[PDB]
Amino acid sequence: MDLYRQSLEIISRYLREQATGAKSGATSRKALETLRRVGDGVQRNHETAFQGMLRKLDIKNEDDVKSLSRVMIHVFSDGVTNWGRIVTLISFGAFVAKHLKTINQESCIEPLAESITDVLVRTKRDWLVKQRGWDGFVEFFHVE
């Protein structure tokens, strides 16, 4: 609750808007705004690595989308955590959501956002709380 629900609201709004191309109070609005700026940047600056990762995952059916969590928890959870990696996790989610629309699996975009939220909140809860959650995310990307 609260941190999970807020995270689910931000990630699912961002994935939905990235796929379609269309568009806790102020924190969620600010988080979406920062995520649109930084997230879109990451996707442009790492299109090559994101395309190569997308090819290795080879998404054809809805069983392929459900199998993403297995790679996701291990890859994301390994190493040191920082806001840069959280953005990469979410931006690659938006990149996968765009290809889901392309292959007529648009309905598996909301469960994808929920899978991303499970990996983020269930592996990094303590770090997120100490970093002031989504408010900490907004001020970390405030300047530049």
Next chain:
Amino acid sequence: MDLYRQSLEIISRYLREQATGAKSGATSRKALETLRRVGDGVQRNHETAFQGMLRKLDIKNEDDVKSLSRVMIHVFSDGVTNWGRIVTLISFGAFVAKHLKTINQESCIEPLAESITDVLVRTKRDWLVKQRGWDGFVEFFHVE
């Protein structure tokens, strides 16, 4: 020349006097006078935002002072330009100069003023010329 040299004279005089506490003809005198009034106001009214920005920059050595230009060009150059932002750029310079004196880096105050001048004149030359330079700055802040 002229616009650059005049800008360097005003900014360096203002940063030097703010740090120490002591004190083109009439235009430069008037500009300094307007900058003392408006600049000191900005520093008092935005002490919280200036302290938070100063903490994020974390200035300990002279390599930290030289690295300021990187953040400065991007932050200043983004968005719409107006005299309010130019004052903010210079007032924050005066705020940084005060802390430089506190940490025995008083000699890196003149190169700081020159770095600020480079960002201002090399990114906003055309706008400054059309706004009548420092004369336009003086009549913009004449009333109130």
